[PDB]
Amino acid sequence: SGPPVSELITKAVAASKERSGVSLAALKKALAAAGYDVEKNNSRIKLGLKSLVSKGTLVQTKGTGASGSFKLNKK
Amino acid sequence: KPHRYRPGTVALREIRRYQKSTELLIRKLPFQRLVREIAQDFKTDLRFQSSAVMALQEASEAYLVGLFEDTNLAAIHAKRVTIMPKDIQLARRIRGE
Amino acid sequence: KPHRYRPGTVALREIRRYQKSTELLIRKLPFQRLVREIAQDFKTDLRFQSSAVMALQEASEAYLVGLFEDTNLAAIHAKRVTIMPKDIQLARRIRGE
Amino acid sequence: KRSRKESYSVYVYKVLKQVHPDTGISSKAMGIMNSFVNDIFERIAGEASRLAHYNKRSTITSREIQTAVRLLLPGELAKHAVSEGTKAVTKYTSA
Amino acid sequence: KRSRKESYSVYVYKVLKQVHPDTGISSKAMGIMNSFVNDIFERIAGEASRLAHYNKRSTITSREIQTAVRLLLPGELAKHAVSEGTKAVTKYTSA
Amino acid sequence: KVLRDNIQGITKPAIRRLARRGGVKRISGLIYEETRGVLKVFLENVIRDAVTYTEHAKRKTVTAMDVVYALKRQGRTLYGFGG
Amino acid sequence: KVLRDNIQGITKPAIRRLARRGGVKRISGLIYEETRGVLKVFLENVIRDAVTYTEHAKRKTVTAMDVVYALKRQGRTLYGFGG
Amino acid sequence: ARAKAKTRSSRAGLQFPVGRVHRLLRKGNYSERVGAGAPVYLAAVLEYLTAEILELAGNAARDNKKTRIIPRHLQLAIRNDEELNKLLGRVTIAQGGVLPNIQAVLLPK
Amino acid sequence: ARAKAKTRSSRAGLQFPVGRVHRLLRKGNYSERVGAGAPVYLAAVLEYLTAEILELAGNAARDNKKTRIIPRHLQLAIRNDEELNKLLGRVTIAQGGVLPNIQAVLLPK
DNA sequence: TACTTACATGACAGGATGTATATATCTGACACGTGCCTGGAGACTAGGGAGTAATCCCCTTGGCGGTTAAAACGCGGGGGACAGCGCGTACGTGCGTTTAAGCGGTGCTAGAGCTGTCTACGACCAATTGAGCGGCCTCGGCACCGGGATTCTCCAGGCGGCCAGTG
DNA sequence: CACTGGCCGCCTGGAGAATCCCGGTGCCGAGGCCGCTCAATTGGTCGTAGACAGCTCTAGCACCGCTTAAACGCACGTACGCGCTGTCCCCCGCGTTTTAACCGCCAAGGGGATTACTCCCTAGTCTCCAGGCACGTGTCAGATATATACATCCTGTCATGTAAGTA
């Protein structure tokens, strides 16, 4: 079981916190390096990132949809 | 609910149908009219054997199937499945026209 | 810092030079050696007129320049500027080899 | 009555009977076979004429036909046709 | 002592001097013109040969080559060629 | 008597069927007109030679004999009509 | 007298130069060996023709004129060599 | 006191007409002289070619459980042999159709 | 006694050898008979063809500030005339090179 | 909420280098004179391919009615094209190094090529026939129709996973 | 905090439809027989094309010594293939309506096309000669080298727009 996907996406985006937002490919590589089945959870992580960007805890940097770059909220 | 096949499945099934079959695929008499239309552009009052229209036809599906197979190869080369004007122009450019 | 051109600009100057120039692009001696090796498979103890090796050289460069210009057409058809092997097999398979 | 128009009917039919005792042939495929044999005959004759010109030779010999077939037919078709023609010319020279 | 080896040097040189009084030639390009006229000769002559043979005609006429040059040369090359050829055969008829 | 526009007689389903024989899965909308143009260009390339053959024979009737002969010259040689 | 690995004699920069004459800007590194293979195929075909011409003439010295004949038979006509 | 009229095709043990092919070579104007063994050799070549292609057509028709050769069978026989295909890449057989050949990207997953 | 010698090329107003073309047609095995005006017509078309190709070669040489024709000039003449290029599509000129031809997407910016 | 400051961007001057450009020079490839001989021309004949006149009949063209398969059109919708954006690599480019192509010179000979001989070999041609083609007839292989089974396809339905709301 | 319904994705069986496969039936092409004629055949002859030996000479090959141009290679960089996703719209599938393709049926006539005739044209042969040409020579267009001028490409620098911290 373990924690659900939202916490691990927040850990993936908060591990680096570059000046530009983190790309989705680097985030997939980071969560795979931490250890996670990204293969059957592409839809899961895409809906999760739409859920978290829509709820305002994280903000989209450049791209649209699941593509592009993701950076943290102001506070 | 009325029944409906998904796109491409009918397409592939009648790919198999027409590749299994051998007969003509252009309507005969409009092709005959088109041939006469080209003929009167060079010399007036031409007459045609029926077999002449047949032979122009067989050559026409020959050249068109060959060109279309080559454009299909050009299209799958460009990671697409739909043939485009650029595919026709490309195939004629390598083929030599 | 020593000077250095960006990629392609040197390549474009090579394009303009070699399309301007007409002399051979492959070295004479290894090509002649290769022709002797190929002919060794068919018949032992063949001798070659120098003009025969020159004509084979012209055939080789002509065929290859044609192959790479059609390969370039295939590559720009696939929205690329880098040719890859599937371009060559596509060009040969359309051309009829 | 109409004048004789030449065809390759009987020869190709007899060859088909030898290679297959049972099967038949349609007439239109038969005309295709006639066109095939005429085309190949024309190709070999054209090569033989060109090699006769190139070596300044006035006579189409069996050597010239053999060289032309080796030119035109690829690989095992070439050497099998060479073998068949060699057997035939040895039979004919042996009368 | 040599054996005879023929080419088309003098005619290409004269027609070059007719179209350009001051323009020279290199020997390699001169051989290219020799081979060009030879190749066009074989093309036109061979297609004239098929037009003769296939209509059961045993003779190459001016009409035969007129048909052949109408075939091979595309567009205005054919029309200019048939025009000057017509003028030339007209002059040869008149002389 | 005269014929002014019959290229639409080579209909869009006819181009579809030709694509289906060639193994084409899906065909763009702009394809049909330029394939009409291509089949056009091929036809006058053949028929110009064919009527050149015919007028050389002093005939006013096109034969399939001359058609396959024009294909023989043009390099798309056809079996099934010679003889 | 024996020749063992002569296909590598057509070096990489020679193929680069040939691509430059063809108008190619960027070439993959995987290209060169299959162009060596394709070039080998082209020469083995044309030299098979030309060698067949040579043994037909009861000669065993290859002449250029036969190479012109071989490219003629491949439909790859070459001027400039006494054709 | 003439001998019996025997045939040169039987002399070569063949059915393709040696005399007729010799006639077509002489009147086909390829040289002013034609050697004796040349049309025999040519007829053997043509007969071998026709024999093997009708052999392939017969196996295609037997595979198609038809007892009669149709142009589809000939088309299949030409295109399924790569050496005959290279021999006959530039030709079209009338009413022959094409091979059933599908690119792997065209087929569904 | 006998008529003074007059060449058939001068009779046709041509520079190309009508007599030599007639001789090569007779020994080229195209037909056993050749009409009299037939080599005249063939020499005329050959002379015309050489006229435009050599004219274009001279123009290209004048563009290159070159007094004499080089094979590069011939290659430039053929490949810049689409009528000649249609005539000589499958043709290689030795030491002719190619046209300066770069695809538009290859250019910078 | 508006004000001031740091970073990204684009425009422009300027240097390095490659490439045009002017001019000297020498050189060998092009251009021209010469002996010649061989192929082109003149004249006349044999004869034959081929243009032309008349006919016929077969095939092509023209046209009319009916049916329906195919074409045309519209709706819907899902799947493909494709624009964009990041990534990771994989050639390009430029430096130095190796070596091996390239040029020049020398020697050999083997085979190309050219000349003479002749002899097998293939064309020419009258007589002859039998092998192959035009025509006709039949029948069974096969096209067409009809009915049952199968496979394929598409979707409805059931199960698991995760997530979010609430007691 | 833990329970539990709700949403999504995945797996699966079942219904329908295109197809495969099994029969019957009637039909017309294929195959086989007969008549015919014309083209292969026989045999001989005659002239000659090419095989065969021999002799020359030249160019292809082998060796070698320098001599750099090029190839190899490595390293640094950047730009290009490309993988993913998201979006938009565009063409496939299907139902309905139309329409002309096809069949099939009949009339006409025009042109292939066949035979006959008679004639111009062209190959052939002998003779004669002059044009194309191998060969020699000389000589200037162009290769080569050197020195300038500019194009162009890449980069550093300055003004501007925009994001961000703050009064």
For the beta carbon of residue C54, count every other beta carbon within 10 angstroms. 21
Enter the tokens of residue D14.
């007899």
**φ and ψ of A42, to 5 deg:** -65, -45
DSSP state of I5: P
Resolution in A: 4.0
Q: In Å, what is the separation between the CA of G28 and the C1' of K154?
A: 26
Q: Is E24 helix (H, G, I), strand (E, B) or coil?
A: strand
Q: Is D37 helix (H, G, I), strand (E, B) or coil?
A: helix
Cβ–Cβ pairs < 8 A, chains C and G: 181
Residue carrying the six token digits 């001798």: C47
For the beta carbon of residue H88, count every other beta carbon within 10 angstroms. 19
Q: Is I63 helix (H, G, I), strand (E, B) or coil?
A: helix
Is H8-87 assigned to CATH 1.10.730.10? no
Residue G51 CA to residue C52 CA, distance in Å, equals: 11
Residue-wise burial string across H43-81, b where 16 or more C-beta atoms lie within 10 A, e elsewhere: bbbbbbbbbbbbbbbbbbbeeeeeeebbbbbbbbbbbeb
Residues β-bridged to residue I69: E25
Half-sphere exposure of G55 (CA within 13 A, CB side): 17
Chain breaks in chain G (C to N over 2.5 A) after: none
Residues β-bridged to residue H68: D24
* CATH number for the domain harbouring residue E73: 1.10.20.10
Enter the tokens of residue H72.
């589809």
Nearest partner of D33 among H76, B21, H53, judged by Cα:
H53
Residue F3 CA to residue B32 CA, distance in Å, equals: 12
- Alpha helices, H only, chain C: 9-20, 28-42, 50-77, 85-95
CATH of span I8-98: 1.10.20.10
Name, in order, each residue with C-beta under 8 angstroms of H86's C-beta and a sequence gap of 6 or more.
D74
- Alpha helices, H only, G1-83: 12-21, 31-56, 64-73
Q: Are D65 and H45 in contact (CB under 8 A)?
A: yes
Residue H31 CA to residue G53 CA, distance in Å, equals: 18
Q: Can you point out the beta strands (E) in B1-97?
A: 47-48, 82-83
Q: Are C97 and G52 in contact (CB under 8 A)?
A: no
Looking at residue I101, its amino acid is: N
Residue C80 CA to residue I48 CA, distance in Å, equals: 44
Kind and range of the H or E run holding G26: strand G26-27
How would you write H37-74 as a 3-class SS string?
Answer: HHHHHHHHHHHHHHHHHHHHHHHHHHHCCCCEECHHHH
Query: What own/partner pairs with CB < 8 Å and gap ≥ 24 does C44-48 have?
Result: C45/G60, C46/G51, C46/G54, C46/G60, C46/G61, C46/G62, C47/G60, C47/G61, C47/G62, C48/G61, C48/G62
DSSP state of I65: T
Do chains C and A meet with 3 or more Cβ pairs nearer than 8 Å?
A: no
Looking at residue I84, its amino acid is: L
Name, in order, each residue with C-beta under 8 angstroms of G6's C-beta and a sequence gap of 6 or more.
C30, C33, C34, C36, C37, C38
Kind and range of the H or E run holding H34: strand H33-34
Enter the tokens of residue D22.
């049972």
Q: In Å, what is the separation between the CA of B32 and the C1' of J77?
A: 38
Nearest partner of E11 among I72, I43, I67, I25, judged by Cα:
I43
In this structure, are strands A69-72 and A58-60 parallel, antiparallel, or unpaired?
antiparallel
Q: CA torsion sign, C83 to C85 to C87 to C92?
A: positive
Nearest partner of B15 among B72, B55, B67, B57, judged by Cα:
B72
Residue C25 CA to residue G42 CA, distance in Å, equals: 17
| Domain coordinates in residue numbering, chain I | 8-98
**Number of domains into which chain D is organized:** 1
Q: Is E75 helix (H, G, I), strand (E, B) or coil?
A: coil
Q: What's the gap between Cα H2 and its chain centre?
A: 36
- With a CB-CB cutoff of 8 Å, which residues 30-69 of chain G face chain C? 30-31, 34-35, 38-44, 46-48, 50-51, 54-55, 60-64, 66-68
Output Rg (C-alpha) for chain I, integer angstroms: 20
Enter the tokens of residue G75.
């439909």
Name, in order, each residue with C-beta under 8 angstroms of D32's C-beta and a sequence gap of 6 or more.
F79, F80, H71, H74, H93, H94
Which nucleotide's C1' atom has the smallest distance to the CA of H17? K40
Can you spell out the DSSP letters for chain F?
A: ------GGGS-HHHHHHHHHHTT--EE-TTHHHHHHHHHHHHHHHHHHHHHHHHHHTT-SEE-HHHHHHHHHHHT--EESS--
For the beta carbon of residue B34, count every other beta carbon within 10 angstroms. 25
Containing structural domain, residue D75: 1-95
Q: Is H33 helix (H, G, I), strand (E, B) or coil?
A: strand
Residue D90 CA to residue H37 CA, distance in Å, equals: 9
Strand K and B10 CB separated by under 7 Å: yes
Residue E35 CA to residue C31 CA, distance in Å, equals: 25
Direct distance between the N- and C-terminal alpha carbons of chain A, in angstroms, rounded to an integer = 30
- For chain G, domains (ranges, CATH) are 1-83 (1.10.20.10)
Do chains F and H meet with 3 or more Cβ pairs nearer than 8 Å?
A: yes
Of D54, D55, D67, the CB nearest to G52: D67
Enter the tokens of residue C43.
């018949």
Nearest partner of I100 among D77, E13, C12, F34, judged by Cα:
C12
Residue B60 CA to residue D48 CA, distance in Å, equals: 33
Name, in order, each residue with C-beta under 8 angstroms of E81's C-beta and a sequence gap of 6 or more.
E69, E73, I44, I45, I48, I49
Containing structural domain, residue A71: 1-75
Pick the residue from chain E with its C-alpha nearest to G77. Answer: E39
For the beta carbon of residue C18, count every other beta carbon within 10 angstroms. 22
